[PDB]
Amino acid sequence: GITRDVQVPDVRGQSSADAIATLQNRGFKIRTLQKPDSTIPPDHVIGTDPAANTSVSAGDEITVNVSTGPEQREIPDVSTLTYAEAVKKLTAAGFGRFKQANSPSTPELVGKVIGTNPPANQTSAITNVVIIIVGSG
């Protein structure tokens, strides 16, 4: 037959703790899912899971998606191959902050990227500014 299923209001616009408390008060169980990412939402609740707006039994389980910190990635040495490669491939790797600089190099490297200013072998954040250095002399 039917049981008592109700829809539970979202705690969007408040912190994850606010959501946790509100659901807890109603008897709902909450699971907090956190991810470090490139496409990071704030630690506050901006959105919720459909399960909340769906009519569910009071005391169901609501997953709260929260993100803690932007992810970091190691810089692949593809920069040295082509300027286009450096910017685009690093964007594909997640990076979204670039700064171009040029450094005087031997004519044999003119027009080629000689690397990055920050160490490429280092794991840099998505929001970290990668300074791409082009060899020009």
mmCIF file of N, CA and C in Angstrom:
data_model
loop_
_atom_site.group_PDB
_atom_site.id
_atom_site.type_symbol
_atom_site.label_atom_id
_atom_site.label_comp_id
_atom_site.label_asym_id
_atom_site.label_seq_id
_atom_site.Cartn_x
_atom_site.Cartn_y
_atom_site.Cartn_z
ATOM 1 N N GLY A 1 0.829 -1.199 0.000
ATOM 2 C CA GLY A 1 0.000 0.000 0.000
ATOM 3 C C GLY A 1 0.852 1.233 0.000
ATOM 4 N N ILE A 2 0.526 2.187 0.841
ATOM 5 C CA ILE A 2 1.301 3.402 0.931
ATOM 6 C C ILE A 2 1.823 3.593 2.337
ATOM 7 N N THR A 3 2.904 4.274 2.449
ATOM 8 C CA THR A 3 3.499 4.555 3.710
ATOM 9 C C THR A 3 3.630 6.072 3.823
ATOM 10 N N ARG A 4 4.270 6.557 4.842
ATOM 11 C CA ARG A 4 4.398 7.974 4.998
ATOM 12 C C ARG A 4 5.687 8.441 4.367
ATOM 13 N N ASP A 5 5.577 8.979 3.189
ATOM 14 C CA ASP A 5 6.719 9.546 2.498
ATOM 15 C C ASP A 5 6.491 11.028 2.338
ATOM 16 N N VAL A 6 7.444 11.809 2.750
ATOM 17 C CA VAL A 6 7.366 13.252 2.686
ATOM 18 C C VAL A 6 8.637 13.802 2.068
ATOM 19 N N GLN A 7 8.574 14.987 1.549
ATOM 20 C CA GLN A 7 9.734 15.600 0.960
ATOM 21 C C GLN A 7 10.390 16.497 1.996
ATOM 22 N N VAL A 8 11.684 16.450 2.071
ATOM 23 C CA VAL A 8 12.392 17.198 3.073
ATOM 24 C C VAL A 8 13.065 18.450 2.444
ATOM 25 N N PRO A 9 12.763 19.660 2.986
ATOM 26 C CA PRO A 9 13.324 20.928 2.489
ATOM 27 C C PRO A 9 14.847 20.966 2.520
ATOM 28 N N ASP A 10 15.400 21.584 1.507
ATOM 29 C CA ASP A 10 16.829 21.687 1.342
ATOM 30 C C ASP A 10 17.384 22.750 2.257
ATOM 31 N N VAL A 11 18.611 22.557 2.672
ATOM 32 C CA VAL A 11 19.298 23.484 3.562
ATOM 33 C C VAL A 11 20.359 24.250 2.731
ATOM 34 N N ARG A 12 20.017 24.444 1.473
ATOM 35 C CA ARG A 12 20.850 25.168 0.517
ATOM 36 C C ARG A 12 20.993 26.636 0.946
ATOM 37 N N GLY A 13 22.206 27.146 0.907
ATOM 38 C CA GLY A 13 22.465 28.522 1.308
ATOM 39 C C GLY A 13 23.091 28.612 2.683
ATOM 40 N N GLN A 14 23.299 27.473 3.293
ATOM 41 C CA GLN A 14 23.846 27.385 4.631
ATOM 42 C C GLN A 14 25.024 26.430 4.611
ATOM 43 N N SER A 15 25.627 26.159 5.745
ATOM 44 C CA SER A 15 26.800 25.321 5.764
ATOM 45 C C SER A 15 26.399 23.855 5.719
ATOM 46 N N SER A 16 27.365 23.000 5.495
ATOM 47 C CA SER A 16 27.141 21.592 5.498
ATOM 48 C C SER A 16 26.684 21.117 6.892
ATOM 49 N N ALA A 17 27.216 21.756 7.943
ATOM 50 C CA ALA A 17 26.840 21.457 9.321
ATOM 51 C C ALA A 17 25.367 21.766 9.552
ATOM 52 N N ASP A 18 24.890 22.871 8.959
ATOM 53 C CA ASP A 18 23.473 23.257 9.059
ATOM 54 C C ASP A 18 22.597 22.167 8.489
ATOM 55 N N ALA A 19 23.022 21.625 7.356
ATOM 56 C CA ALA A 19 22.304 20.548 6.705
ATOM 57 C C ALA A 19 22.301 19.313 7.580
ATOM 58 N N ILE A 20 23.466 18.980 8.102
ATOM 59 C CA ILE A 20 23.638 17.813 8.956
ATOM 60 C C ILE A 20 22.724 17.907 10.185
ATOM 61 N N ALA A 21 22.710 19.064 10.816
ATOM 62 C CA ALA A 21 21.896 19.286 12.001
ATOM 63 C C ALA A 21 20.400 19.210 11.682
ATOM 64 N N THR A 22 19.984 19.882 10.618
ATOM 65 C CA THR A 22 18.575 19.934 10.247
ATOM 66 C C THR A 22 18.025 18.529 9.947
ATOM 67 N N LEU A 23 18.754 17.762 9.150
ATOM 68 C CA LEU A 23 18.342 16.409 8.830
ATOM 69 C C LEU A 23 18.338 15.528 10.077
ATOM 70 N N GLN A 24 19.343 15.718 10.930
ATOM 71 C CA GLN A 24 19.498 14.966 12.175
ATOM 72 C C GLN A 24 18.289 15.211 13.080
ATOM 73 N N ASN A 25 17.866 16.478 13.154
ATOM 74 C CA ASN A 25 16.711 16.884 13.976
ATOM 75 C C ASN A 25 15.437 16.231 13.494
ATOM 76 N N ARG A 26 15.344 16.031 12.193
ATOM 77 C CA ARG A 26 14.176 15.389 11.591
ATOM 78 C C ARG A 26 14.276 13.866 11.646
ATOM 79 N N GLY A 27 15.436 13.362 12.012
ATOM 80 C CA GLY A 27 15.595 11.929 12.160
ATOM 81 C C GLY A 27 16.263 11.297 10.966
ATOM 82 N N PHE A 28 16.599 12.111 9.995
ATOM 83 C CA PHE A 28 17.244 11.653 8.798
ATOM 84 C C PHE A 28 18.702 11.413 9.069
ATOM 85 N N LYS A 29 19.258 10.509 8.346
ATOM 86 C CA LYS A 29 20.638 10.192 8.474
ATOM 87 C C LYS A 29 21.342 10.852 7.335
ATOM 88 N N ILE A 30 22.537 11.265 7.542
ATOM 89 C CA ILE A 30 23.254 11.966 6.524
ATOM 90 C C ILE A 30 24.600 11.370 6.291
ATOM 91 N N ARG A 31 24.978 11.339 5.059
ATOM 92 C CA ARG A 31 26.281 10.910 4.684
ATOM 93 C C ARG A 31 26.950 12.059 4.008
ATOM 94 N N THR A 32 28.115 12.400 4.445
ATOM 95 C CA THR A 32 28.798 13.498 3.868
ATOM 96 C C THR A 32 29.830 12.984 2.879
ATOM 97 N N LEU A 33 29.737 13.441 1.667
ATOM 98 C CA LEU A 33 30.632 13.031 0.628
ATOM 99 C C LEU A 33 31.474 14.240 0.292
ATOM 100 N N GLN A 34 32.773 14.126 0.460
ATOM 101 C CA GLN A 34 33.648 15.221 0.186
ATOM 102 C C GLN A 34 34.622 14.847 -0.896
ATOM 103 N N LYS A 35 34.902 15.774 -1.754
ATOM 104 C CA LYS A 35 35.862 15.563 -2.801
ATOM 105 C C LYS A 35 36.731 16.793 -3.003
ATOM 106 N N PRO A 36 38.037 16.614 -3.133
ATOM 107 C CA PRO A 36 38.915 17.658 -3.638
ATOM 108 C C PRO A 36 38.833 17.602 -5.163
ATOM 109 N N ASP A 37 38.690 18.726 -5.835
ATOM 110 C CA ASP A 37 38.425 18.642 -7.286
ATOM 111 C C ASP A 37 38.890 19.896 -8.033
ATOM 112 N N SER A 38 38.628 19.920 -9.306
ATOM 113 C CA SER A 38 38.932 21.011 -10.169
ATOM 114 C C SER A 38 37.695 21.885 -10.191
ATOM 115 N N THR A 39 36.557 21.232 -10.247
ATOM 116 C CA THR A 39 35.304 21.898 -10.246
ATOM 117 C C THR A 39 34.740 21.778 -8.837
ATOM 118 N N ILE A 40 35.318 22.551 -7.962
ATOM 119 C CA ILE A 40 34.950 22.560 -6.565
ATOM 120 C C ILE A 40 33.817 23.534 -6.186
ATOM 121 N N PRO A 41 32.733 22.996 -5.631
ATOM 122 C CA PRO A 41 31.732 23.787 -4.919
ATOM 123 C C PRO A 41 32.280 24.184 -3.529
ATOM 124 N N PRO A 42 31.755 25.253 -2.916
ATOM 125 C CA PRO A 42 32.170 25.670 -1.569
ATOM 126 C C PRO A 42 31.720 24.663 -0.492
ATOM 127 N N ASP A 43 32.346 24.706 0.683
ATOM 128 C CA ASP A 43 32.024 23.768 1.801
ATOM 129 C C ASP A 43 30.586 23.929 2.328
ATOM 130 N N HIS A 44 29.917 24.933 1.832
ATOM 131 C CA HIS A 44 28.539 25.218 2.186
ATOM 132 C C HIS A 44 27.625 24.496 1.219
ATOM 133 N N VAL A 45 26.374 24.420 1.536
ATOM 134 C CA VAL A 45 25.461 23.728 0.691
ATOM 135 C C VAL A 45 24.944 24.684 -0.365
ATOM 136 N N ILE A 46 25.226 24.375 -1.600
ATOM 137 C CA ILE A 46 24.729 25.153 -2.713
ATOM 138 C C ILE A 46 23.637 24.386 -3.408
ATOM 139 N N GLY A 47 23.731 23.092 -3.327
ATOM 140 C CA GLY A 47 22.798 22.230 -3.951
ATOM 141 C C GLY A 47 22.633 21.016 -3.118
ATOM 142 N N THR A 48 21.661 20.251 -3.417
ATOM 143 C CA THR A 48 21.333 19.097 -2.658
ATOM 144 C C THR A 48 21.117 17.905 -3.564
ATOM 145 N N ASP A 49 20.764 16.794 -2.980
ATOM 146 C CA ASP A 49 20.535 15.592 -3.733
ATOM 147 C C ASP A 49 19.040 15.422 -3.896
ATOM 148 N N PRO A 50 18.582 15.003 -5.111
ATOM 149 C CA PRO A 50 17.159 14.793 -5.442
ATOM 150 C C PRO A 50 16.362 14.042 -4.381
ATOM 151 N N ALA A 51 17.035 13.168 -3.638
ATOM 152 C CA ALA A 51 16.412 12.367 -2.577
ATOM 153 C C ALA A 51 15.701 13.240 -1.543
ATOM 154 N N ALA A 52 16.180 14.464 -1.368
ATOM 155 C CA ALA A 52 15.582 15.378 -0.411
ATOM 156 C C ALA A 52 14.225 15.890 -0.907
ATOM 157 N N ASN A 53 14.167 16.309 -2.165
ATOM 158 C CA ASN A 53 12.917 16.853 -2.733
ATOM 159 C C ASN A 53 11.963 15.769 -3.176
ATOM 160 N N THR A 54 12.407 14.544 -3.133
ATOM 161 C CA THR A 54 11.554 13.434 -3.448
ATOM 162 C C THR A 54 10.819 13.066 -2.159
ATOM 163 N N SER A 55 9.600 12.590 -2.256
ATOM 164 C CA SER A 55 8.908 12.179 -1.075
ATOM 165 C C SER A 55 9.497 10.851 -0.608
ATOM 166 N N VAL A 56 10.146 10.887 0.525
ATOM 167 C CA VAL A 56 10.800 9.738 1.101
ATOM 168 C C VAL A 56 10.349 9.581 2.538
ATOM 169 N N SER A 57 10.597 8.454 3.110
ATOM 170 C CA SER A 57 10.207 8.225 4.465
ATOM 171 C C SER A 57 11.053 9.086 5.412
ATOM 172 N N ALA A 58 10.395 9.730 6.361
ATOM 173 C CA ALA A 58 11.057 10.585 7.323
ATOM 174 C C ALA A 58 12.035 9.782 8.150
ATOM 175 N N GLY A 59 13.286 10.062 7.948
ATOM 176 C CA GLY A 59 14.317 9.323 8.597
ATOM 177 C C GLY A 59 15.099 8.516 7.595
ATOM 178 N N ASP A 60 15.078 8.964 6.346
ATOM 179 C CA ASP A 60 15.817 8.299 5.278
ATOM 180 C C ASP A 60 17.261 8.824 5.323
ATOM 181 N N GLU A 61 18.050 8.533 4.329
ATOM 182 C CA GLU A 61 19.429 8.943 4.334
ATOM 183 C C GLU A 61 19.685 9.934 3.216
ATOM 184 N N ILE A 62 20.209 11.068 3.572
ATOM 185 C CA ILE A 62 20.493 12.120 2.629
ATOM 186 C C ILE A 62 22.005 12.285 2.494
ATOM 187 N N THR A 63 22.485 12.215 1.291
ATOM 188 C CA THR A 63 23.872 12.419 1.033
ATOM 189 C C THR A 63 24.120 13.911 0.772
ATOM 190 N N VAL A 64 25.095 14.441 1.441
ATOM 191 C CA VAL A 64 25.454 15.825 1.327
ATOM 192 C C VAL A 64 26.771 15.909 0.584
ATOM 193 N N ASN A 65 26.763 16.563 -0.553
ATOM 194 C CA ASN A 65 27.967 16.690 -1.346
ATOM 195 C C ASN A 65 28.676 17.969 -0.968
ATOM 196 N N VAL A 66 29.890 17.831 -0.538
ATOM 197 C CA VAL A 66 30.705 18.942 -0.136
ATOM 198 C C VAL A 66 32.080 18.754 -0.773
ATOM 199 N N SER A 67 32.780 19.801 -1.016
ATOM 200 C CA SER A 67 34.072 19.677 -1.601
ATOM 201 C C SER A 67 35.093 20.404 -0.767
ATOM 202 N N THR A 68 36.174 19.737 -0.469
ATOM 203 C CA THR A 68 37.175 20.318 0.343
ATOM 204 C C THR A 68 38.498 20.443 -0.421
ATOM 205 N N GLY A 69 38.819 21.662 -0.788
ATOM 206 C CA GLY A 69 40.060 21.947 -1.448
ATOM 207 C C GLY A 69 40.067 21.616 -2.934
ATOM 208 N N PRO A 70 40.697 22.446 -3.751
ATOM 209 C CA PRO A 70 40.885 22.123 -5.129
ATOM 210 C C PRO A 70 41.971 21.059 -5.257
ATOM 211 N N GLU A 71 41.830 20.224 -6.235
ATOM 212 C CA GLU A 71 42.735 19.137 -6.469
ATOM 213 C C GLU A 71 44.065 19.680 -7.020
ATOM 214 N N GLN A 72 45.075 18.863 -6.994
ATOM 215 C CA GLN A 72 46.374 19.225 -7.502
ATOM 216 C C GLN A 72 46.783 18.184 -8.515
ATOM 217 N N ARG A 73 47.621 18.539 -9.443
ATOM 218 C CA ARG A 73 48.061 17.602 -10.442
ATOM 219 C C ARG A 73 49.532 17.858 -10.723
ATOM 220 N N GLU A 74 50.224 16.848 -11.154
ATOM 221 C CA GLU A 74 51.616 16.955 -11.504
ATOM 222 C C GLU A 74 51.649 17.479 -12.908
ATOM 223 N N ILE A 75 52.542 18.379 -13.190
ATOM 224 C CA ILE A 75 52.598 18.974 -14.511
ATOM 225 C C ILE A 75 53.323 18.037 -15.489
ATOM 226 N N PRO A 76 52.622 17.529 -16.515
ATOM 227 C CA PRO A 76 53.254 16.701 -17.522
ATOM 228 C C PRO A 76 54.165 17.556 -18.403
ATOM 229 N N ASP A 77 55.304 17.033 -18.775
ATOM 230 C CA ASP A 77 56.206 17.787 -19.612
ATOM 231 C C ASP A 77 55.830 17.632 -21.064
ATOM 232 N N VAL A 78 54.831 18.364 -21.418
ATOM 233 C CA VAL A 78 54.344 18.426 -22.769
ATOM 234 C C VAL A 78 54.497 19.871 -23.250
ATOM 235 N N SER A 79 54.803 20.730 -22.295
ATOM 236 C CA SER A 79 54.971 22.135 -22.501
ATOM 237 C C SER A 79 56.094 22.399 -23.503
ATOM 238 N N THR A 80 57.228 21.768 -23.256
ATOM 239 C CA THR A 80 58.458 21.888 -24.041
ATOM 240 C C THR A 80 58.265 21.506 -25.547
ATOM 241 N N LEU A 81 57.156 20.883 -25.850
ATOM 242 C CA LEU A 81 56.898 20.423 -27.184
ATOM 243 C C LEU A 81 56.315 21.544 -28.037
ATOM 244 N N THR A 82 55.331 22.248 -27.515
ATOM 245 C CA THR A 82 54.669 23.320 -28.251
ATOM 246 C C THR A 82 53.936 24.236 -27.241
ATOM 247 N N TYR A 83 53.884 25.538 -27.524
ATOM 248 C CA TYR A 83 53.175 26.513 -26.680
ATOM 249 C C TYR A 83 51.693 26.150 -26.544
ATOM 250 N N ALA A 84 51.082 25.787 -27.665
ATOM 251 C CA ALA A 84 49.688 25.346 -27.698
ATOM 252 C C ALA A 84 49.480 24.146 -26.784
ATOM 253 N N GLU A 85 50.427 23.216 -26.837
ATOM 254 C CA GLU A 85 50.394 22.008 -26.029
ATOM 255 C C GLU A 85 50.434 22.332 -24.565
ATOM 256 N N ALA A 86 51.289 23.260 -24.196
ATOM 257 C CA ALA A 86 51.461 23.617 -22.805
ATOM 258 C C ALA A 86 50.159 24.123 -22.216
ATOM 259 N N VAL A 87 49.560 25.084 -22.881
ATOM 260 C CA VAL A 87 48.339 25.668 -22.380
ATOM 261 C C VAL A 87 47.165 24.686 -22.442
ATOM 262 N N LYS A 88 46.951 24.086 -23.595
ATOM 263 C CA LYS A 88 45.802 23.220 -23.776
ATOM 264 C C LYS A 88 45.877 21.923 -22.993
ATOM 265 N N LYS A 89 47.027 21.271 -23.022
ATOM 266 C CA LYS A 89 47.181 19.992 -22.342
ATOM 267 C C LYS A 89 47.102 20.155 -20.846
ATOM 268 N N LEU A 90 47.670 21.229 -20.324
ATOM 269 C CA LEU A 90 47.555 21.497 -18.905
ATOM 270 C C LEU A 90 46.123 21.850 -18.517
ATOM 271 N N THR A 91 45.392 22.500 -19.421
ATOM 272 C CA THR A 91 43.982 22.780 -19.189
ATOM 273 C C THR A 91 43.210 21.442 -19.109
ATOM 274 N N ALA A 92 43.579 20.507 -19.986
ATOM 275 C CA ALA A 92 42.995 19.172 -20.017
ATOM 276 C C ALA A 92 43.388 18.377 -18.770
ATOM 277 N N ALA A 93 44.526 18.722 -18.196
ATOM 278 C CA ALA A 93 45.001 18.099 -16.967
ATOM 279 C C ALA A 93 44.288 18.705 -15.755
ATOM 280 N N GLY A 94 43.601 19.807 -15.981
ATOM 281 C CA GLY A 94 42.828 20.415 -14.944
ATOM 282 C C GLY A 94 43.185 21.860 -14.687
ATOM 283 N N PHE A 95 44.430 22.238 -14.967
ATOM 284 C CA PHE A 95 44.931 23.586 -14.658
ATOM 285 C C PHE A 95 44.155 24.654 -15.415
ATOM 286 N N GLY A 96 43.915 25.774 -14.764
ATOM 287 C CA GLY A 96 43.187 26.837 -15.417
ATOM 288 C C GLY A 96 43.806 28.195 -15.213
ATOM 289 N N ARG A 97 45.031 28.233 -14.733
ATOM 290 C CA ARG A 97 45.703 29.500 -14.501
ATOM 291 C C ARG A 97 47.056 29.495 -15.162
ATOM 292 N N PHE A 98 47.219 30.332 -16.158
ATOM 293 C CA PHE A 98 48.462 30.418 -16.888
ATOM 294 C C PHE A 98 48.974 31.841 -16.944
ATOM 295 N N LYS A 99 50.269 31.948 -17.054
ATOM 296 C CA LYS A 99 50.977 33.191 -17.210
ATOM 297 C C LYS A 99 52.137 32.919 -18.158
ATOM 298 N N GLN A 100 52.222 33.651 -19.238
ATOM 299 C CA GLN A 100 53.288 33.436 -20.198
ATOM 300 C C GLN A 100 54.463 34.360 -19.947
ATOM 301 N N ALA A 101 55.633 33.790 -19.994
ATOM 302 C CA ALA A 101 56.861 34.505 -19.882
ATOM 303 C C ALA A 101 57.823 33.938 -20.913
ATOM 304 N N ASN A 102 58.828 34.680 -21.262
ATOM 305 C CA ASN A 102 59.818 34.235 -22.224
ATOM 306 C C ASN A 102 61.168 34.417 -21.631
ATOM 307 N N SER A 103 62.024 33.482 -21.870
ATOM 308 C CA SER A 103 63.349 33.521 -21.349
ATOM 309 C C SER A 103 64.347 33.387 -22.503
ATOM 310 N N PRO A 104 65.434 34.183 -22.492
ATOM 311 C CA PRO A 104 66.465 34.112 -23.520
ATOM 312 C C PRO A 104 67.130 32.738 -23.542
ATOM 313 N N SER A 105 67.060 32.084 -24.668
ATOM 314 C CA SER A 105 67.629 30.767 -24.825
ATOM 315 C C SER A 105 68.422 30.714 -26.122
ATOM 316 N N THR A 106 69.147 29.630 -26.318
ATOM 317 C CA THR A 106 69.911 29.383 -27.513
ATOM 318 C C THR A 106 68.957 29.396 -28.729
ATOM 319 N N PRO A 107 69.396 29.926 -29.905
ATOM 320 C CA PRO A 107 68.581 29.960 -31.143
ATOM 321 C C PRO A 107 67.977 28.592 -31.503
ATOM 322 N N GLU A 108 68.618 27.527 -31.064
ATOM 323 C CA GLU A 108 68.135 26.177 -31.301
ATOM 324 C C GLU A 108 66.815 25.896 -30.569
ATOM 325 N N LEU A 109 66.496 26.694 -29.569
ATOM 326 C CA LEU A 109 65.276 26.491 -28.803
ATOM 327 C C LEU A 109 64.286 27.620 -29.041
ATOM 328 N N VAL A 110 64.616 28.532 -29.959
ATOM 329 C CA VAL A 110 63.740 29.667 -30.233
ATOM 330 C C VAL A 110 62.359 29.190 -30.720
ATOM 331 N N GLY A 111 61.323 29.665 -30.077
ATOM 332 C CA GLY A 111 59.978 29.324 -30.497
ATOM 333 C C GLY A 111 59.475 28.053 -29.846
ATOM 334 N N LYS A 112 60.291 27.474 -29.009
ATOM 335 C CA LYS A 112 59.931 26.294 -28.279
ATOM 336 C C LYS A 112 59.801 26.651 -26.825
ATOM 337 N N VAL A 113 59.003 25.914 -26.115
ATOM 338 C CA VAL A 113 58.860 26.125 -24.711
ATOM 339 C C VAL A 113 59.990 25.380 -24.040
ATOM 340 N N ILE A 114 60.649 25.982 -23.078
ATOM 341 C CA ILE A 114 61.750 25.277 -22.433
ATOM 342 C C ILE A 114 61.311 24.629 -21.134
ATOM 343 N N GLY A 115 60.078 24.892 -20.760
ATOM 344 C CA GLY A 115 59.509 24.298 -19.591
ATOM 345 C C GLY A 115 58.574 25.250 -18.903
ATOM 346 N N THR A 116 58.412 25.080 -17.632
ATOM 347 C CA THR A 116 57.609 25.958 -16.842
ATOM 348 C C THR A 116 58.503 26.636 -15.817
ATOM 349 N N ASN A 117 58.070 27.754 -15.257
ATOM 350 C CA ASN A 117 58.879 28.403 -14.226
ATOM 351 C C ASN A 117 58.795 27.613 -12.910
ATOM 352 N N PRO A 118 57.559 27.278 -12.392
ATOM 353 C CA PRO A 118 57.445 26.391 -11.244
ATOM 354 C C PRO A 118 57.817 24.981 -11.695
ATOM 355 N N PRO A 119 58.324 24.139 -10.792
ATOM 356 C CA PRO A 119 58.761 22.793 -11.152
ATOM 357 C C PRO A 119 57.608 21.946 -11.680
ATOM 358 N N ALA A 120 57.808 21.373 -12.850
ATOM 359 C CA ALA A 120 56.785 20.576 -13.509
ATOM 360 C C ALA A 120 56.591 19.250 -12.794
ATOM 361 N N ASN A 121 57.607 18.839 -12.080
ATOM 362 C CA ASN A 121 57.580 17.565 -11.372
ATOM 363 C C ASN A 121 56.890 17.717 -10.047
ATOM 364 N N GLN A 122 56.447 18.909 -9.765
ATOM 365 C CA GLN A 122 55.755 19.176 -8.560
ATOM 366 C C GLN A 122 54.275 19.118 -8.817
ATOM 367 N N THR A 123 53.576 18.758 -7.818
ATOM 368 C CA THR A 123 52.151 18.647 -7.888
ATOM 369 C C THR A 123 51.561 20.026 -7.540
ATOM 370 N N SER A 124 51.054 20.711 -8.528
ATOM 371 C CA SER A 124 50.520 22.027 -8.341
ATOM 372 C C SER A 124 48.993 22.009 -8.405
ATOM 373 N N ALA A 125 48.363 22.898 -7.661
ATOM 374 C CA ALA A 125 46.910 22.975 -7.601
ATOM 375 C C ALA A 125 46.301 23.469 -8.904
ATOM 376 N N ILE A 126 45.036 23.146 -9.101
ATOM 377 C CA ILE A 126 44.275 23.537 -10.295
ATOM 378 C C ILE A 126 44.212 25.070 -10.426
ATOM 379 N N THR A 127 44.128 25.719 -9.297
ATOM 380 C CA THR A 127 44.019 27.140 -9.209
ATOM 381 C C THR A 127 45.389 27.824 -9.089
ATOM 382 N N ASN A 128 46.452 27.050 -9.189
ATOM 383 C CA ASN A 128 47.791 27.587 -9.073
ATOM 384 C C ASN A 128 48.186 28.143 -10.431
ATOM 385 N N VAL A 129 48.872 29.257 -10.446
ATOM 386 C CA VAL A 129 49.226 29.905 -11.687
ATOM 387 C C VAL A 129 50.486 29.286 -12.275
ATOM 388 N N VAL A 130 50.339 28.638 -13.397
ATOM 389 C CA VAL A 130 51.454 28.035 -14.061
ATOM 390 C C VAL A 130 52.073 29.049 -15.001
ATOM 391 N N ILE A 131 53.316 29.345 -14.762
ATOM 392 C CA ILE A 131 54.044 30.252 -15.593
ATOM 393 C C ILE A 131 54.755 29.438 -16.645
ATOM 394 N N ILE A 132 54.345 29.618 -17.855
ATOM 395 C CA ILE A 132 54.880 28.906 -18.968
ATOM 396 C C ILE A 132 55.944 29.782 -19.619
ATOM 397 N N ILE A 133 57.145 29.258 -19.725
ATOM 398 C CA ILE A 133 58.255 30.017 -20.252
ATOM 399 C C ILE A 133 58.644 29.552 -21.651
ATOM 400 N N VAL A 134 58.615 30.476 -22.570
ATOM 401 C CA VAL A 134 58.953 30.215 -23.950
ATOM 402 C C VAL A 134 60.395 30.650 -24.198
ATOM 403 N N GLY A 135 61.122 29.868 -24.961
ATOM 404 C CA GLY A 135 62.483 30.188 -25.260
ATOM 405 C C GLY A 135 62.563 31.145 -26.418
ATOM 406 N N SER A 136 63.104 32.301 -26.177
ATOM 407 C CA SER A 136 63.259 33.288 -27.207
ATOM 408 C C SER A 136 64.587 34.002 -27.053
ATOM 409 N N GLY A 137 65.314 34.074 -28.115
ATOM 410 C CA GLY A 137 66.562 34.746 -28.141
ATOM 411 C C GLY A 137 66.709 35.302 -29.502
#
